[PDB]
Symmetry: D2
């Protein structure tokens, strides 16, 4: 009987997960399910925990909902572990998205400057959690959604013995969903060759019933990409690529929404503020756990289907280290995901992905050594930072901004 533990129990997305297991219970015999959160989130936990406990009873599935704060008990022989928390809360994402704004620089949640400090705050906690699993459940799996998944994944590989780790995004299932509606066709008649890193993944090839239709799909993309650029690239870009191929335009959006709706996080907070109110008794942001259940299932069941996840490269992509973390199509087995080969990333886009790995790597190191000097190198080399100078300012400032979460620097 399966025991599952989730950290970030009081999340906005928590019901999407418990629904997912309900729809897929026949093959996923989940016994206990534990929801963990931290003291400054106890309220939101105890709210959706009941809604979970309600969704369950209304479906006749015998899933026991366990709510707790003593994380260490929820790991006591866990079988699978999911992580959907956000360190520093939404209030922290607000800082990440406005401090860059002063400087003309992107203030997104997982790219540029914000992404860096999202990691510095977070991946200590990830390693902190694993240091517990090595005592409470060393055979357990770590399935991870806490962003930046592609950097958090790289931490675990570089700084931990944990070989059992997987990361998820909704960018892949998004792009599929996706080119389906572009061809106006039942989605599972479409399969895409993914390769790249998280929030930096490409659709290398597109098949409709096994026949490549990548060219014809690309022509139909004319969120707007230049025809000649996209046609000439011969691959299909991720939504986060506008941050690198359409930078000024983006930038535009981050500026204007600040005056108006507020920042994305700010906009998020309200929508999230009033969403808990629904949860208090008797639709945007992610699918992150419709793609999480598919994975937890296939692993458990050894289904050996093909899903795009984050795992050890092992040479799937030539230019990325074998010991590093990529986001590619994997055969999904009980021993883990298993990368299908790619060869290398296409020339045109090979360097920019190389540019992001370097950033994740240096960022991951600083988050763990706590070394100011490393963190500064991290921002400056990032492609959404113009100068060492500006870099130093945002760094010195955002350091101070999240002092509470960044002890390793003091």
């Amino acid at each position: 009987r399966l025991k599952m533990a989730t950290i970030g129990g009081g999340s906005s997305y928590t019901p999407e997960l418990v629904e997912g297991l309900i729809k897929r219970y026949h093959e996923l015999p989940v016994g206990e399910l534990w929801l963990v959160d931290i003291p400054e989130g106890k309220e939101k936990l105890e709210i959706v925990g009941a809604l979970a406990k309600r969704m369950v009873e209304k479906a006749g599935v015998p899933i026991e909902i366990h709510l707790t704060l003593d994380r260490r008990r929820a790991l006591e022989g866990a079988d699978f572990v999911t992580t959907q928390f956000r360190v520093g809360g939404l209030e922290a994402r607000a800082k990440d998205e406005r401090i860059p704004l002063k400087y003309g620089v992107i203030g997104q949640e997982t790219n540029g400057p914000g992404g860096l400090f999202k990691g510095l705050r977070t991946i200590p906690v990830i390693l902190d959690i694993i240091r517990d699993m090595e005592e409470l459940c060393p055979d357990a799996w770590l399935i991870n959604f806490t962003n930046p998944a592609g950097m958090v994944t790289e931490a675990v590989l570089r700084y931990t013995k944990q070989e059992k780790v997987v990361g998820l995004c909704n960018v892949p299932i998004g792009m599929r969903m996706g080119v389906a509606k572009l061809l106006g066709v039942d989605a599972d008649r479409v399969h895409i060759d993914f390769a790249g890193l998280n929030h930096m993944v490409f659709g290398l090839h597109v098949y409709l019933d096994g026949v490549e239709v990548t060219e014809k799909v690309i022509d139909l993309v004319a969120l707007g990409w230049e025809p000649d650029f996209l046609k000439g690239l011969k691959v299909l870009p991720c939504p986060y690529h506008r941050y690198y191929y359409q930078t000024d335009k983006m930038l535009a959006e981050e500026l204007e929404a600040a005056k108006t709706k507020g920042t994305r996080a700010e906009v998020v907070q309200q929508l999230e503020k009033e969403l808990f109110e629904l949860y208090k008794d008797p639709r945007g942001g992610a699918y992150y756990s419709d793609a999480a259940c598919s994975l937890i299932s296939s692993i458990y069941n050894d289904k050996r289907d093909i899903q795009p996840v984050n795992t050890r490269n092992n040479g799937a992509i030539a230019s990325i280290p074998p010991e590093s973390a990529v986001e590619v199509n994997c055969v999904i087995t009980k021993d883990g995901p298993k990368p299908i080969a790619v060869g290398d990333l296409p020339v045109a886009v090979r360097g920019l992905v190389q540019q992001i790995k370097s950033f994740e790597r240096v960022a991951a190191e600083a988050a763990v050594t706590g070394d100011y000097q490393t963190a500064l190198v991290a921002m400056t080399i990032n492609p959404l930072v113009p100068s060492d100078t500006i870099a130093k300012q945002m760094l010195d400032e955002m350091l101070e901004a999240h002092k509470e979460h960044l002890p390793q620097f003091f």
Copy 2:
């Protein structure tokens, strides 16, 4: 032994035939030739007569011949070199101003300009070879004609000429540059260079063969203008072209006021050069070929010293394909340069130069094929261009700007 030189009328031919006088000791050059296009016929002869002067003032039996008919200068030629500029220096003028409109760097071998400087040159280099194989299939090819980086690269991928080297003054500069600093003879200081042209690093700095790199950096950072902690944490030593990348903002602040005030360097040079021909009638900028004489000498006498040049990677830089071109330290040999092994670039700098490789490569294919889509991909993926849309505009404006010497597009 018959040398031959393309772009005889260059401002730098002094620096050239001044190199040889200090090395007739080993270079039995009988007939030297200087060529140019009929559009520079005059500026050629203003210096041609200045050649025959100093080979008379130093007593050297070197036959100064001048010609427009290029092929007769490849009549049994043994060495062939290239310092010419396609489009004149008026072409460089457009490439520094058209980007200024858009906020994009208007440099001659970086960003948009670099793409176009290439797009013009490469097909001509290929033509020089096309009949270099005709009249000198045994002869060497030594090149400056920027962008040296993507000129070498293009030559490997689209020709069967194995006899190619590339030179830039960035390392030699950085040598004496760093040499001066400590305060010893250049003879007493050596550096490990790995990278590409205008993308080359002081990986380690030696003083007598003892590595002092941490010291040296700490001096540079605390006597250009580099952030201290950035420079210390990158633990290596940037090219002077790394400001366009690590200091992009400052660098375009500078390109603008210098455009209001004194004009772009193309323009500042256009006069200062049109006045240097003044002195060339009877009695700053580069080392680009004193340092590229040290080579040719070593090549003939097989001296096996250690000079930084541009040659087929052959796996010395792990992340660059072996079939591509890099700027690395090399053993010089009568059979060719032989790169020492670098391993791979440090992590923090690996993505950046991987981009430049990608840029060079795409810009190469566009220059040869003449494809618009490949060209736009070149302009978009370059780390100095903010949008597909900006890139789309600049590309059309500069294509049109140079209709004359892009006859493979039209």
Copy 3:
């Protein structure tokens, strides 16, 4: 409606194939099926062609059997092409297996000296067949069983544009069948991680219902392997590995059977002589086409299951070139097989597999250039040849032996 063409139509195994399609017709709508053979085999063709035509009618499957000698018509818009012929007939395998015997050297059919000349005879014909498909069916697939599959595959990749090529063996399905009977368990509860080259493939990992049981399976292997060797190797060896880890013992067998039953080919010939007699009107050697139909099906159907075949490495195995041919697990899709990553081959066994690739490569070249000098290098470096001298003798002798089939050498 599918059109399939097979060369080597009059083969002993031909009925196993036509049975295979019969059992799997529901998903494999095979319209026409053509059986091709050559004049000196017309008799054996016209015999089993009727037995095929009989197996079909007795099953109610509407598969038209087409027998021919005009190969070029059988390819006229073929959809799939299989090759099971053997150049030089069984009489040629007799020579390959006895001429080494004089010299103390292995005389097997696809390893050592015999394998070399099996290639030199064969892979011209393979390329000869493809030179036809490029005119008659350029969208057709080439599925290949004609040994040596691992060398024949490498020819097509190196010397042909044909990207659509796959090779089969029964060694994989054999080893599975295999460790099943070793655990005494339903075979499809067992899946093995294959990696290596054809007739040189290893069972890297063994799973029973997704749990690795590789260790416990290996202990049960004690055809006998030393416990400590096999346990210490931590992988599972192919049947052809006794030729390299158990050499003298093998060698033994090839010697003794010569005195007695005759050579394998000789033994084969009788068993095959009397087997055609059964075929004339109203069980050993291979499964090579129970694994062929599984593949032709999955490709056609896009089943995306996992089968171990021979395809372009593309970095699936680090130490083997990306452009070369390996024998690994592949996801099987309509665009082709798709290698799951391996990383590299385990250290212990990495070199011996490297040793075989080199042999296939040099052998493949000589078979096509016809260069004596290359062929000599081929044998001498092979691991079952003791000296350049002996090498030269068997080479000079077997050259003469198969002059008729080896025109490229004269």
Copy 4:
């Protein structure tokens, strides 16, 4: 500057302190030390007094000190070298005879013997380092103590000593060897060496820096004993240890009659050496350390010449891991040797040396761990051992043969 030498009592110390006299010019060696184990105390002093002679006959202020207490000789030592033999030359006796029983090569650094010569040495080298870090963490380590190939390798993988070089006379031999041939000064001939120890190739041969390799080969093949066409088609130039591999049969014909007749070289040497100490009382085999003086000199004065040595691959040989050891040409530098890049080995020879790498690697791990299973895998996979079964027997016989100085097995 205090040199220190382990295996002072070696037969070759003449060749050592004769090197230095021709290079006191640049080597300020004050106190030199010569050490050995108490079991060679006498043979040490027979030559120790011969040291103090020639540093008196040439007028050199080098303090010849002798000691058994090894550590006092590492008292502030600056250079450390190794020529000792573990087990005496009586141990080499067993390793050349025990294989003879089985038909297997009884060489000292190839096949079974090589494995065992290693299995004895490696753990001792690691011990010398274990306290070299104690008393000379700044000091270099230069090694001959065969097998040089797997001694270097082991040191990289199981120690943090970066300061290591390895020497063998095979290349220097092959130099003058090939130099002699044509008939010019050695100063006028250079070769490109790529491979491993006793597994090193003349990739190209230069005469003044012009490549004459095709000529040179055609001379060697038509004035050892190499097949003409084999040697011409391999287009490179084998080590004299490639007969054990490309001529295995002839090589054991020779080891047998030489065993009947004159005895094994261990024995032939045992006397010829016990009689060379005769002359060492008052007034053939190697260059293994005249050529390894040329190094130490270059290392101190940073001469940056080109000598073939054994160092961390660092990617110079593509197929060898970068973390492993190769025998390649190198630039010699006060910071260390710096391999020129080879690219990869030619195809025909790549598998062979990949095996030797595999052999070296396994033999290393067995020597350190002391695992029986790892040891048998080492003996079986070696390309000179015919069976697991033969290997099983030899391994037990030689383990027992050397119980004394394999204390990590017992």
